[PDB]
Amino acid sequence: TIAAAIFDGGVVLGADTRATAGPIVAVKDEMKLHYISDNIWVCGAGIAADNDNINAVISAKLRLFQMNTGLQPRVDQCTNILASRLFQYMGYIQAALIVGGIDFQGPQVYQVAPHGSFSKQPFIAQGSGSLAAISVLENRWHNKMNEHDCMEMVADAIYAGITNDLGSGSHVNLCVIKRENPEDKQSKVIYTFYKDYRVPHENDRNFRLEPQINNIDVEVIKTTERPLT
Amino acid sequence: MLSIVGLQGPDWVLIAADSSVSSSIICMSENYDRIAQLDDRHALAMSGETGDCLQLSEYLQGNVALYKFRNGVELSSDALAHFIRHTMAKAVRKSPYEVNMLLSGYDGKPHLYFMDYLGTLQSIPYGAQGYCQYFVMSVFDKHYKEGLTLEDGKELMKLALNQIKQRFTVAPHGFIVKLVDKNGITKIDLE
Amino acid sequence: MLSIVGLQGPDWVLIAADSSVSSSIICMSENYDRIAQLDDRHALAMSGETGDCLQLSEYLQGNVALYKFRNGVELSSDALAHFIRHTMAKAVRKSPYEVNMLLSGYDGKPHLYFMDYLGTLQSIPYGAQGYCQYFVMSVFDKHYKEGLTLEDGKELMKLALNQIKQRFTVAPHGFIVKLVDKNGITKIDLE
Amino acid sequence: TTLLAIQCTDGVVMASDSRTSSGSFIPNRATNKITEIQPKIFAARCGNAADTQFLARAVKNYLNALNITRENTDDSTILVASNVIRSLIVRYRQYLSAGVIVGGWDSAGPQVYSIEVSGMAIKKKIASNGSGSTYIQAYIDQNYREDMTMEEATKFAIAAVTGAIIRDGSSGGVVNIVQINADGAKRMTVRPAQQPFNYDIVKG
Amino acid sequence: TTLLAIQCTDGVVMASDSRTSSGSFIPNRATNKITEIQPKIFAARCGNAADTQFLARAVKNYLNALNITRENTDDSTILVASNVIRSLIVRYRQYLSAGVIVGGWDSAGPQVYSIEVSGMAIKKKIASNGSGSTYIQAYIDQNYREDMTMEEATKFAIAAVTGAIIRDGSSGGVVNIVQINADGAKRMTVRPAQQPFNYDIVKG
Amino acid sequence: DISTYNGSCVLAMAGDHCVAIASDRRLGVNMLTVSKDFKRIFQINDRIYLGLAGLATDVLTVREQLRFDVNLLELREERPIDPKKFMNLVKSTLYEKRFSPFFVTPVIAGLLPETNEPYLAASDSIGAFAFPKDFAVAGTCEESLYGICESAWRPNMNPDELFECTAKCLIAAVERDSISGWGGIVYIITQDKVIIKEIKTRMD
Amino acid sequence: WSPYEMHGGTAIGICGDDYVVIGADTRLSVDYSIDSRHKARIFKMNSNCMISATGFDGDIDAFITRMRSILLNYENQHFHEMSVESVARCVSNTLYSKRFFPYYINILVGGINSEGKGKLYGYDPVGTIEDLHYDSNGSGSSLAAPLLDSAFGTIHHNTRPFPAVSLQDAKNIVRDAICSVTERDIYTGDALQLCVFTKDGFAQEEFPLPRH
Amino acid sequence: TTLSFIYNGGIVVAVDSRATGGQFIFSQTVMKILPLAPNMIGTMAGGAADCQYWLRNLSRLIQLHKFRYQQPLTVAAASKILVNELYRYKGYNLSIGSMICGYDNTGPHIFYIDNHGSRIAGKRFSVGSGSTHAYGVLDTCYREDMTKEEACELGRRAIYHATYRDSGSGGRVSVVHITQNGVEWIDKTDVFDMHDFSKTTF
Amino acid sequence: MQVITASGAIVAAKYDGGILLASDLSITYGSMFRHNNVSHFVEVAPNIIIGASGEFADFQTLIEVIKSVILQQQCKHNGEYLTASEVHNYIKRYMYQCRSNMKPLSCKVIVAGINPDGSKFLACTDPYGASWESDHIGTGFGKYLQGLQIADVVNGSFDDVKKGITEVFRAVNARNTTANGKIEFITVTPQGINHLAPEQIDPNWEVV
Ligand SMILES: *C(=O)[C@H]1N[C@](C)(CO)[C@](C)([C@H](Cc2ccccc2)NC(=O)[C@H](Cc2c[nH]c3ccccc23)NC(=O)[C@H](Cc2c[nH]c3ccccc23)NC(=O)CCCCC)O[C@@H]1C
Ligand SMILES: *C(=O)[C@H]1N[C@](C)(CO)[C@](C)([C@H](Cc2ccccc2)NC(=O)[C@H](Cc2c[nH]c3ccccc23)NC(=O)[C@H](Cc2c[nH]c3ccccc23)NC(=O)CCCCC)O[C@@H]1C
């Protein structure tokens, strides 16, 4: 479950932290919200390596763009590059991305489908828990909502996916792209990443047999030690 | 598709069969008798799934015995061959017996019948079911003389079986060869 | 999936291979050498399509010779094994060499390498490629003593090959067995 | 999807629904299916959003390429856009599953070109595409008039796209309207509350 | 195929095209797709002609069976016909690919029941089925009135089936109309010359 | 399947300033045990070890490509590759084959150069890397290792206790995985030495 | 069309000298969707045994209904409730009666025999019966099986006597294993129905599990 | 891996105990020898449910014949009953690889039966994924004039080597020694204990 | 499991006074909005209503079967109706028998009733005969587009459960292609089954 909505002064992206190796939770604290530029973040659903590499590649492209050109990467620019890259792979790179950022055109949230389709929407939810998240976003998102309301809404959407979707779980990470000065629309676009913005307590391991009963006796055939050099 | 060979002579039929039974790539046994003696006069070499050849052999032998007991007379080699063909044709229409057979018999005159799984009944002087028919036929063709002596017939059957052993990729570990003649069915060793 | 077996000893490697080459169900030849002597020190038993094993053997032998001529030194058994594995891994990524090999070698010390078609390189004391690995391993496991004499090793290889012949359904007509030791590669007859 | 481009006397009215459908899920219910190729060239997009968006991107690229070597940037731009979309749909016929109604205004006046998913480009005064357009075919036939102005064509296009929205699951949401005249393009959004009718016309 | 049964105040108007399609071939261009189950029970048939004709045959059989043990032959006959067609479509869901609009008049008045190919029987005042009905959905929505009389519903049904005929290749030929009131059923054939419009409404 | 062609079981584990990385020693061809001496764990550098679980082919291909890369990087930079930098190198190596993935899953167990902190990096076949602070699991015994380690792992395991769970928590997993096992080997990388203990697992 | 849903959820049985503890997650989920969060998959069958079922829930219910009817027939026609051994054999026979249209359900028959001993039987969908001392079924069976193997080392040394744990030690092993499976299995969670069959009979506890 | 061989001292039937679905070892304590009659056992290889259910049903049929008729049911008879019952389900995708071993009036008998309907009499059989390895041990180390201990060890070692070389074989070798005096359940020996960890070649 | 004419999402949730079910009154033929004002719920007993999401032909078959069984038991029990538990048990058995006969009913069936003991009974049988009793059940995109809106208020006040179901069905109308028309609400309370006026639950269209 990843999501991203636009509030009055910026964008709130959010993602669960579960990565699944099929039916098994491979990662319980996986990072799906990825910095693209100081003004653009991308949450990602789909194949974990696909999202990681597409986000790293477009982040590198826009970092080069900002270093050479000196220009703040645009959310539509990031989305166009992601959409073109995902389209040239014909959906093979399974990265359903949400690009949330701020540029001179304000705060923008785009979705980029794995096949290279893209769309600017006020709020987006993608991933296996996208429907549970998008219910929350549909019933909670409104124009010019404030930063905290959108934070709570996006966190509740990620949490809806966590609770309802088995492919989604663990914590809610958020990122809030805003401007350092809400009054000034030319003020620096900052991002605040809330790692573990929600850590659902009912999803914590309630029990643990601390004196682990173990009857497997380890027999060492051979022990060889070497200096760590 | 196991190797069964048949060689009808003037007054005998040498009926050989792959004596080795395998479970996939494992040779389970090396003396497996695939020539079901349906009667004291008829040996039916069978080539196919061991468990379908066994069931067909049991059914055919039981029906031959039932004919002999119910009717005091025994089935002729032609009559038994046509009964087997009737069984195989009924099956292939309903549930094919995946068993290709050589019915050797001696009802006073030697008989050898090619009997495919479908129900193809054909009296033959010699024949084979399995892939060995691709290897033995020419041998027989090149070396079968009319009026073979039983020893010349044994040499010819040994020739065909050695052709299988030497040239057939899936070469049987050995063959069980039975002589069907006026003395009944006797397991003869080709040496 | 032809039967190749290997048995590394204290100072030798007995490398056997199915000596019979077949075209489908026909045994075309019975003395076919599937153990390509890549070098005077290395015999690569090959199991697979005869025409892919031949091409891989020619490439590997030519590259070993090229290494020996270009560089005055010869490839080690480990180095040659890793070069073969590199070839097989490149192929499997591009166009797999459907050839499972046992690289026996003696570069001053006996070496036997399991080398699957994919590029699985593993030094082994004994091994097999084909279905014979299901039949010979236990034999070796049950009868391989550390420090085997070359004659005990020959008896053990004969044991494994007779296990293939007796229990493997697709039983090779025979095996070509080569001793790879300080004297090079010599076709030895297990009797 | 519902697309309806009407070449009127005084301009082009490109209407569409806003529903992107992923099965029975609407990943984008405010989809802008009429892409602005140029200020007065728009591409109503039907089919794979990736494919049709690539077509819009590539036709923008090809129209800029058309203008590399010329100064009459406003000449044959709708016709060239249609030709390029046709060439891309034919060239990527295996890959692209996309039909584009490229409508708008250029030096040649108001023009609508329907490039079907097959890659068949045809100049139309009334072009319709998408699964929703089917439901409104008879409606269009009985309510389209060649003499409709851009206002009349806009009202008709809103009504037709609303009918397709109501009857088509793949069509829904707002009616995205683009009115392209010589002076430029005006975008309008007819949200379900502002649409002439809703689900209640079904059996009544 | 186009089928359009309208339950009016004074009767039922079952319109259909007459085109049986075998691929792009019309084996029967004067197909009577509205089968007379009983003098005032008719089955507009969509789908496999064999399957729908078997459904009509079997519902005639089941309605006669319904009347074996009763004398109120005119009671619940449309409803029982719809129930039976539903039961046959569900029972032969694997085999039968058929949707039947059973409309007509019985003791309960004028009734139209659309039994979809799925086997979903629903009482409707306006039921439409077939590939051609799709093209007229919006048209029906914007031109059907619950207050239409059998004359008004007949004119509307002819117009709608004509639109479906024009736009649907699978729909064509004449409009077969059945007007069932308490007094019985009147069949009409609107040949293409008598139809309100023709192919020329397409883009104009 | 090719992922289970060579049964694998790799298990890295975090202790108190010490990592463990254990592997089953089996080289199996599907259900056949070829060897009990297969090396899946490779010293990348003094404080980085790589356990490659999966196709022995790809295990050696990726171990040797990573050795190529790390040797070149250490020659150019004249310093050992950092565990994080080697993790990124492994991710790059595995995603370079994104469309033809290696059938190997890496488990990087290292000590961070400065703080000697345990560094676990488990990834899928294409470099999607997790960085568990407790344990990394890979191979055909993946789920088994996940469960046993999730229950068994405790913070601040000293090299003795860390080896004890690596061995026990690997024995439990391999002895439930038919195609992996046949002995284990645990590399305990502590701040000053590496202890390679060959552990007795079941040989069936 | 597969007539199953392969729902998931994990069950873990541990027999003891005088007890059988089967803990099963109550999650009824499939295809990343949770149909129910509390669908008890352990059923008290009679005063001697309980049946834990994992797998397709329709098959679980059909099999449990059939086994309840079979046990009721047995209690009527024998005037004593079916023993855990007899119920275990009936479970094997019932699962095999659908051998070619299997109940895609894994069964644990955990009960107390006439000797007061805890008897646990593990099954596959087609009715293989293993008279075992601990077993795991369901989506997290692979996760939990090594956990029970460590707890008992029976897999490691299968000829050594089963190191039976206290009833509470078995309950804690099942709880910890279910918690681990829940942490790693997406189809296991929302609760742990921890049922214990002793001489006292059937005693059910519910423990919250992570619902993510 | 199951195996059964007749030698001069009787029948030695050694089976592993591993039930493995896919690559996961579901059990290591499953009983793959089923006693059918006082002097006759059946081994299990293939579908565990199929093998155990059908050996249980063969035991029921043998008991029915025993109570119905004074004539003892031979091992050949039990094998034929089982192979007819299995052929009744020919095409039903049963998976039974069994050895019906035991002593009857005619002495020792092993019949390899399978769901395919095969029924092969023999003095030496091995069924299951590790059958080839157990065969490698048996055909090589088998002697007709073995001792009871030597024969039990031969079966045990054949199963152990099959478990080592077969992923589908493992657990504990259950060794039974059938004689004219009945089925003797020699013992269950963990193949883990049988492995020689002094040796390094395997 | 073929769904041609589909009933859309159902969202049932227990509240203090009963079970509030909600569903559009639309049947969709494929993606087409085919029929309107078709209640996806059928009152089978005075305190037992049955809805279904999916093949509405299969829902009609099931409702005919349920009504025949209820009538049989009413004949047996002097007009006394089967309890919601009994009706759901029969639906579970029938749908599992249909999935085992390989002719499954392609409809997730909700049984919402008040048992004679006054206990709210909300259960659901999926097309495969897998059944479960919950305090709230979503079928179709009423399950997926659900989040915590129902779980957080289930068994709460009628207004809270109505608000949560309205949130879920706003999500359904926004994001379900087959969602058409007003969402009818039905309260199954110990005082009977009340069909509340259908509501047009509008997605927030300021998003554009
Ligand atoms: C809500 O809906 C969330 N759902 C889950 C499944 C995220 O946990 C996704 C969709 C998530 C996206 C994501 C993005 C960035 C990092 C992690 C995760 N998807 C996954 O985690 C995927 C699921 C998956 C697998 N295959 C496909 C195909 C299409 C779509 C989705 C998927 N999981 C993975 O990619 C696996 C990660 C993995 C497996 N073992 C690991 C060990 C250590 C570290 C990571 C491991 N990898 C694979 O399955 C291998 C793929 C090989 C392809 C050739 O996120 C949203 C928010
Ligand atoms: C020789 O080397 C040994 N090989 C193995 C594989 C024994 O483990 C066999 C052949 C053995 C026979 C056997 C006999 C009696 C008891 C146990 C085992 N086979 C198995 O163990 C099989 C392997 C298997 C998997 N799928 C098929 C299909 C056809 C034939 C064989 C197989 N395993 C099983 O049958 C499973 C046993 C079992 C016990 N508890 C379980 C819990 C959960 C899952 C499985 C369990 N059962 C199933 O796979 C049932 C699947 C039903 C799906 C609807 O023995 C010789 C000696």
Burial tier of E178 (Cβ tally within 10 Å: 0-12, 13-18, 19+): buried
β-strands D109-115, D98-106: how paired? antiparallel
Tell the residue nearest (CA) to atom 5 of ligand 2. H168
Q: What amino acid occupies position B27?
A: C
Output the six-digit token pair for G193.
């129905």
Confirm if A191 and A38 have CB atoms less than 8 A apart. Answer: yes
Tell me which of H32, H94, H101, H175 to substitute to probe ligand 2's pocket, judged by most ligand atoms within 8 Å of the beta carbon. H32
Q: What angle do CA H83, H88, H89 make, to 5 degrees?
A: 100
Residue F131 has phi, psi (to 5 degrees) of: -130, 65
Confirm if E140 and E132 have CB atoms less than 8 A apart. Answer: no
Sign of the torsion angle spanned by Cα atoms E15, E18, E22, E25: negative
Q: What angle do CA H106, H110, H114 make, to 5 degrees?
A: 135
Q: What amino acid occupies position G156?
A: H
Q: Rounded to whole angstroms, how far apart are CA atoms I147 and I159?
A: 18
Tokens 């003094």 -> residue: F46
Residue A75 has phi, psi (to 5 degrees) of: -65, -40
Between chains, do D163 and E137 touch, taking CB under 8 Å as contact? yes
Residue burial G45-67, b: 16+ Cβ < 10 Å; e: rest: bbebbbbbbbbbbbbbbbbbebb
Q: Rounded to whole angstroms, how far apart are CA atoms G121 and B185?
A: 54
Alpha helix positions (H), chain C: 50-70, 77-94, 133-143, 150-167
CA distances to G101, I111, I131 from I94, rounded to whole Å, are 17, 13, 11
Q: What is the nearest CA distance from C130 to chain F, expressed in angstroms? A: 11
Tell the residue nearest (CA) to atom 21 of ligand 2. H19
CA distances to A1, A108, B71 from A13, rounded to whole Å, are 11, 11, 92
Residue C91 has phi, psi (to 5 degrees) of: -60, -50
Burial tier of B74 (Cβ tally within 10 Å: 0-12, 13-18, 19+): middle
Q: Rounded to whole angstroms, how far apart are CA atoms I41 and D49?
A: 36
CA distances to E13, E147, G9 from E4, rounded to whole Å, are 8, 16, 51
Q: What is the H or E stretch that residue C35 is in?
A: strand C35-37
Q: Nearest to residue B33, comparing CAs of B177, B143, B191, B133?
A: B177
Alpha helix positions (H), I32-187: 56-76, 84-100, 141-144, 158-175
Q: Rounded to whole angstroms, how far apart are CA atoms A34 and B160?
A: 76
Cβ neighbours for A198, distance < 8 A, ≥ 6 positions apart: A155, A158, A159, A171, A172
Confirm if C172 and C181 have CB atoms less than 8 A apart. Answer: no
Q: Nearest to residue F172, comparing CAs of H163, G21, G152?
A: G152
Confirm if B44 and B101 have CB atoms less than 8 A apart. Answer: yes
- Helix/strand/coil (H/E/C) assignment for every residue in H80-146: HHHHHHHHCCCCCCCCEEEEEEEEECCEEEEEEEECCCCEEEECEEEECCCHHHHHHHHHHHCCCCC
Strands, DSSP E only, in chain E?
3-7, 12-16, 20-22, 25-28, 34-38, 41-47, 98-106, 109-115, 121-124, 126-129, 175-181, 184-190
Number of residues that this document lists for chain H: 202
Cβ neighbours for E173, distance < 8 A, ≥ 6 positions apart: E17, E18, E19, E26, E29, E30, E31, E165, E192
Cβ neighbours for D36, distance < 8 A, ≥ 6 positions apart: D42, D43, D178, D185
Among chain D residues, CA nearest to I9: D24
For residue G37, the number of C-alpha atoms closer than 13 Å in the C-beta half-sphere is 19
Confirm if F9 and F174 have CB atoms less than 8 A apart. Answer: yes
Among chain G residues, CA nearest to A17: G212
Three-state secondary-structure class, residue D65: helix
Three-state secondary-structure class, residue E84: helix
For residue E45, the number of C-alpha atoms closer than 13 Å in the C-beta half-sphere is 27
Q: Rounded to whole angstroms, how far apart are CA atoms D171 and A134?
A: 19
Between chains, do A228 and F190 touch, taking CB under 8 Å as contact? yes
Beta bridge partner(s), residue F189: F19, F194
Q: How many CB atoms lie within 10 A of CB I67?
A: 15
Q: Nearest to residue B45, comparing CAs of B162, B168, B159, B157?
A: B157
> What's the DSSP call for residue B76?
P
Q: Rounded to whole angstroms, how far apart are CA atoms G155 and G146?
A: 9
Residue burial E6-40, b: 16+ Cβ < 10 Å; e: rest: bbbebbbbbbbbbbbbeeeebeeeebbbbbbbbeb
Residue burial A199-217, b: 16+ Cβ < 10 Å; e: rest: ebeebeebbebeebbbbbe
Q: Rounded to whole angstroms, how far apart are CA atoms I120 and I48?
A: 10
Three-state secondary-structure class, residue D197: coil
Q: Rounded to whole angstroms, how far apart are CA atoms C88 and C113?
A: 13
Q: Rounded to whole angstroms, how far apart are CA atoms A109 and B62?
A: 82
Cβ neighbours for D197, distance < 8 A, ≥ 6 positions apart: D159, D162, D163, D166, E141, E142
Output the six-digit token pair for G59.
């098959």
Tokens 């894994």 -> residue: G106
Q: How many CB atoms lie within 10 A of CB F187?
A: 24
Name the residue among D30, D32, D50 with its Cβ closest to that of A116.
Answer: D50
Q: Rounded to whole angstroms, how far apart are CA atoms D201 and D204?
A: 5
Output the six-digit token pair for G148.
């029970």
Q: Rounded to whole angstroms, how far apart are CA atoms D21 and D33?
A: 12
Q: What amino acid occupies position I7?
A: S
Cβ neighbours for I181, distance < 8 A, ≥ 6 positions apart: D199, D200, D202, I24, I25, I26, I33, I36, I37, I198, I200
Cβ neighbours for B54, distance < 8 A, ≥ 6 positions apart: H83, H117, H118, H119
Cβ neighbours for G210, distance < 8 A, ≥ 6 positions apart: A169, A202, A203, A204, A205, A206, G179, G182, G183, G189
Q: Nearest to residue A100, comparing CAs of A89, A91, A109, A88?
A: A109
Three-state secondary-structure class, residue B142: helix
Q: Rounded to whole angstroms, how far apart are CA atoms C108 and I69?
A: 88
Q: Nearest to residue C52, comparing CAs of C6, C117, C110, C142?
A: C117
Helix, strand, coil percentages for chain E (3-state, nearest 5):
30, 35, 35
Confirm if G49 and G111 have CB atoms less than 8 A apart. Answer: yes
Output the six-digit token pair for B19.
């004596």
Q: Do chains D and A touch (3 or more CB pairs under 8 A)?
A: yes
Beta bridge partner(s), residue H179: H182
Cβ neighbours for I159, distance < 8 A, ≥ 6 positions apart: none
Confirm if E10 and E169 have CB atoms less than 8 A apart. Answer: no
Confirm if H149 and H109 have CB atoms less than 8 A apart. Answer: no
Output the six-digit token pair for A166.
């088995």
Tell the residue nearest (CA) to atom 24 of ligand 1. A47
The separation between the first and the last C-alpha atoms of chain D, rounded to the nearest angstrom, is 24
Catalytic-labelled residue, pool D1, D35, D77, D162: D1
Q: How many CB atoms lie within 10 A of CB E204?
A: 11
The separation between the first and the last C-alpha atoms of chain F, rounded to the nearest angstrom, is 21
Three-state secondary-structure class, residue B156: helix
Q: Nearest to residue F48, comparing CAs of F139, F120, F100, F101?
A: F120
Burial tier of A105 (Cβ tally within 10 Å: 0-12, 13-18, 19+): exposed
> What's the DSSP call for residue I176?
B
Instruction: Tell which H residues from 17 to 36 touch F, by Cβ distance under 8 Å.
Output: 18, 20, 23-25, 28
Three-state secondary-structure class, residue C115: strand
Three-state secondary-structure class, residue F102: coil
Ligand 1 neighbourhood includes A129 CB (under 6 angstroms):
yes
Q: Rounded to whole angstroms, how far apart are CA atoms B32 and B53?
A: 12
Between chains, do H93 and G100 touch, taking CB under 8 Å as contact? yes
Q: Nearest to residue B17, comparing CAs of B182, B173, B181?
A: B173
Q: What angle do CA A104, A108, A112 make, to 5 degrees?
A: 130
Distance C131 CA to ligand 2 centre (A): 22
Q: Rounded to whole angstroms, how far apart are CA atoms I123 and I134?
A: 6
Residue I199 has phi, psi (to 5 degrees) of: -115, 135
> What's the DSSP call for residue A170?
S
The separation between the first and the last C-alpha atoms of chain B, rounded to the nearest angstrom, is 25
Whether chain I has a CB inside 8 Å of the CB on D5: the answer is: no
Residue F168 has phi, psi (to 5 degrees) of: -70, -50
Among chain C residues, CA nearest to H156: C142
Q: What is the H or E stretch that residue I133 is in?
A: strand I131-133
Q: Nearest to residue I51, comparing CAs of I142, I176, I161?
A: I142
To the nearest 10°, report the CA torsion of B114, B115, B118, B122: 50
Q: What is the H or E stretch that residue F169 is in?
A: helix F159-174
Cβ neighbours for F64, distance < 8 A, ≥ 6 positions apart: none
Q: Is D1 assigned a catalytic role? A: yes
> What's the DSSP call for residue A201?
G
Please give the interface size between A and D, counted as residue pairs whose CB atoms are below 8 Å apart.
42
Beta bridge partner(s), residue F109: F49, F120
Whether chain E has a CB inside 8 Å of the CB on I60: the answer is: yes
Q: Nearest to residue G212, comparing CAs of H71, B140, A159, E104?
A: A159
Between chains, do C167 and H132 touch, taking CB under 8 Å as contact? yes
